[PDB]
């Protein structure tokens, strides 16, 4: 056999490849098309680990499904991108990208070149950005009511919508506490310092955000207190045990007293560490590494409560919450490194497990959202929805501009692009106007998932958006009627919708540039 490329190297090319990519993308779109809006339905995904994921989140769904077509791979990747960047719009992006590729299929069948289509798409994207920024409105982020409405307009499309007020307040409190500035750098890190702990049982209405943190831990010794009302807290990265040296420290004994002297020396070392700790007069000591029983003895003699092996992330949150500074050498321990600011340390039994609360903090720059509910799956969905809520709150606090929902923004932008296209005289006017009408898919899908007549409602809406001050008009995903968003209250973050449009248009551009698939070749 005289081949040039290895067998298993299969090469497709041309309009078959183009149509295949577009069909794979629009299939990814049809998978989650119904998961958009307030009247969506849940999907039960089965993990390879025997798990279950009951969700409405586009990125959760697409991340749990597996594909082999590279266009579908790219669509799943852009859903991941939207989730990582803004944490919302994970299904709006998929649907818009699918519709853009769908409308590009026309021009590709009609002998237009993909580069022409792409240049038109990029023109349209810039003009979309312009139109969104013109129709956006500002926000007074000090207005907790405005912020709660922003968060409700984002979680109404999720399961927690029944506990909307609770979840909104939880997310707002968590983000406002995680807001932190040091050396002129503002930081809302709701991934390291807003923690969600799901404890099955109880009821969701008792879920709360703590003014402090919570870990699943107990005292090292039951003689230690489990309730302290003004704890001075010390955090350590070092083991309070006697460990070996880094070198070959081998000893050689010939005298009798030397063995006992060595063991007593170990004990004295632990005593000296514990005294270096006691000198700061703490109430609680929390370690990422072990704590020997002799160290426990000395701390208890000092009336200190110890928690043995905490995670680095939990320790960092305890630091931010109680105002402490993690240390690694109790000899280097300072009052500035001691943690004052926690208002109560409690260690209580939730079910048959012991949980440590460091709550009642003042100015805690970290938090723990304690979720309670029927099951790990329900609580996983509540946690994902709360991630959405907190990420939306964060996007707003960073860029306080808002845009109207219910497809109002899509219709306003489509109208503006159609109006700008009348000055266009080249051949790109057609793909340009096509992406403009391809933005209409969001209200179309909303109407479909509400169960109303897309033709009639979308026609009335496209007509409403030809009037002057009607860029706020959209549709209810709950009744199937056109309303003013100024009256309904569904306002999305400009950052979210910008990222959505950009990701959609660029995904379309990528899949349009793609041709001539090749496969088989092994790295």
């Amino acid at each position: 056999p005289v081949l040039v490329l290895s067998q298993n190297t299969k090469r497709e090319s041309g309009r078959k490849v183009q149509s295949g990519n577009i069909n794979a993308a629009k299939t990814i779109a049809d998978i989650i098309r119904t998961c958009l809006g307030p009247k969506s339905m849940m999907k039960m995904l089965l993990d390879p680990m025997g798990g279950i994921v009951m969700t409405n989140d586009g990125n959760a769904i697409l991340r749990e499904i597996q594909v082999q077509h590279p266009a579908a791979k790219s669509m799943i990747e852009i859903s991941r991108t939207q989730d990582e960047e803004v944490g919302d719009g994970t299904t709006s992006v998929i649907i818009l990208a699918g519709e853009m590729l769908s409308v590009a299929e026309h021009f590709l069948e009609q002998q237009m070149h993909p580069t022409v289509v792409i240049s038109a798409y990029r023109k349209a994207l810039d003009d979309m950005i312009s139109t969104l920024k013109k129709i956006s409105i500002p926000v007074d982020i000090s207005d907790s009511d405005m912020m709660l409405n922003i968060i409700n307009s984002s979680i109404t499309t999720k399961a927690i919508s029944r506990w909307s007020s609770l979840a909104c307040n939880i997310a707002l409190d968590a983000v406002k506490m995680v807001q932190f500035e040091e050396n002129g750098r503002k930081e809302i890190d709701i991934k390291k310092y807003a923690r969600v702990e799901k404890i099955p049982g109880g009821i969701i209405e008792d879920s709360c955000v703590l003014r402090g943190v919570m870990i699943n831990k107990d005292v090292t010794h039951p003689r230690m207190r489990r309730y302290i009302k003004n704890p001075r807290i010390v955090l350590l990265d070092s083991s309070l045990e006697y460990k070996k040296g880094e070198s070959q420290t081998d000893i050689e004994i010939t005298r009798e007293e030397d063995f006992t002297r060595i063991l007593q020396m170990e004990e004295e070392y632990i005593q000296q560490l514990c005294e270096d700790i006691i000198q700061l007069k703490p109430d609680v000591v929390i370690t990422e590494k072990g704590i020997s029983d002799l160290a426990q003895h000395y701390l208890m003699r000092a009336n200190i409560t110890a928690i043995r092996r905490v995670r680095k992330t939990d320790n960092n949150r305890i630091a931010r919450a109680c105002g402490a500074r993690i240390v690694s050498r109790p000899e280097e321990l300072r009052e500035d490194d001691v943690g004052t600011g926690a208002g109560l340390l409690e260690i209580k039994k939730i079910g048959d497990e012991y949980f440590t609360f460091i709550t009642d903090c003042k100015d805690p720059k970290a938090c723990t959202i304690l979720l309670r509910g029927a099951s790990k799956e329900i609580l996983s969905e509540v946690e994902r929805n709360l991630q959405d809520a907190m990420q939306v709150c964060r996007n707003v606090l960073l860029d306080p501009q808002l845009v109207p929902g219910g497809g109002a923004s899509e219709m306003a932008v489509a109208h503006a692009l159609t109006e700008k296209s009348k000055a266009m005289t080249g051949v790109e006017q057609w793909p340009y106007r096509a992406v403009a009408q391809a933005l209409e898919v969001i209200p179309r899908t909303l109407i479909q998932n509400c169960g109303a007549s897309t033709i009639r409602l979308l026609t009335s809406l496209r007509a409403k958006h030809t009037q002057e001050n009607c860029e706020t008009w959209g549709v209810n995903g709950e009744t199937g009627t056109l309303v003013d968003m100024k009256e309904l209250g569904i306002w999305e973050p400009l950052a979210v919708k910008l990222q959505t449009y950009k990701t959609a248009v660029e995904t379309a551009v990528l899949l349009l540039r793609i041709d001539d698939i090749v496969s088989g070749h092994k790295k």
Binding site: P200, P222, E256, E266, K349, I378
Partner: protein, 525 residues
Amino acid sequence: AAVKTLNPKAEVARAQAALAVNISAARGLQDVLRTNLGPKGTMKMLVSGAGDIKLTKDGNVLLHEMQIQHPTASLIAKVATAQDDITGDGTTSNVLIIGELLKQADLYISEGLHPRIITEGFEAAKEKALQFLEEVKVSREMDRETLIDVARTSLRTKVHAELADVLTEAVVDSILAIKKQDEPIDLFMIEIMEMKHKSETDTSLIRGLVLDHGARHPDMKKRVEDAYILTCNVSLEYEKTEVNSGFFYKSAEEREKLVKAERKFIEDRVKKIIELKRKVCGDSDKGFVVINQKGIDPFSLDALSKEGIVALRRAKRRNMERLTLACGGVALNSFDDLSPDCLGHAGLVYEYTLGEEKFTFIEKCNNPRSVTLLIKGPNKHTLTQIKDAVRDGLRAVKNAIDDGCVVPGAGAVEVAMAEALIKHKPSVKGRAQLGVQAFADALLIIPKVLAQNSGFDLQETLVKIQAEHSESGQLVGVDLNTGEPMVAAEVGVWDNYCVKKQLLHSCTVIATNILLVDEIMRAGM
């Protein structure tokens, strides 16, 4: 379909198919667990792949032991597991109410009603039912008699009636002993030890502790009357140095001196114990029992026996606290400055051998805030069954104390809540009245199944009970011996307010989410 065009080996259940799948699995679980409900329920036998036998009437155990591979079944098993982890009771009723909500909702969904509308009705009915539950709950001074009625209502469902009459007093006394006024009850402070020698009605409450081990030196006494208990966490065996050491000698005499010296460190702790013993027991009148969470080598065991100390080694990290709460000493990780105030007292300590195992009883403590329930029985499966039952009963009494309220049982609260929901229905806007009706007819599955298990006609019994509750307004339920209505609060059939609330909440939530599932999908390949 769409997913199958991208992942060809993908399994998918669509809008009609996913609802059918989920509701079918829920009703299958309901059909299996219907028979567990009530004291007249039937015990199932469960045989592992190894051949091990489990006799159970408990919904959670039955769920986890059945041989099932269904996604909806996994969802419902997890909700039941949460019910069990938080309340200790309500798993069977949980599964039954879930299945009945799904069935009563399918009744209207098959005629084209939307599951969204059914779930809206579910939310309205949940609100009204929680209100009615808080209204009918009986806030009662938790006396021994009330707690006995509660523990009986649980143990009579889980085991036979005479064994339940034993376990009732056992559980109630144990909890009433380890409980401090206005201090959450730590059930860890009730040890649970199983012995496999006598009848199941020999299960008792030892007002002290029972360790599953004894002394390892034969010359050590097997019975001690007035005992000083030393609870320690200090190694009394040979400890090697952390840093690598090694011994170097030039003569057998030096080797002998080093052999005598290498143990001085632990000999010193043995001497500290022995000196405390001599100072507190100037003679052999009283006794001295060392209980070590860590090891004790034979040399130390000999040294303590020679001085008349009974040393147990490798106790449990929970027994440290249990011993300091029963006896009344201090658990030590060091003998630096040990004093007689570090010791506890037990008016009796002795040893019990059972075949190849040994037990150590520590009894006649003054006011032990930690106790043990000794589960005696002739078979491993009898012991396991009684362990499960006493877990349920302990949780029940603990919950009755926590919630100073207690709710009538025998389907009384369900009957009354169904009537209240049906009287509330007109205030509900739209076709969510149908979701309300479905919620009510689902609540009615508890009295229905109780009648079905006592051997009565569900419809006739339920009509009698509902008629009595409408004519009198008294909270009436099923009499499992006559099929007639009876006042559960008057006959002493009590349920946990926490259990009923958790049922309402979690069942409504999981049923809503299942009804709103529109696609089951396995596409991880």
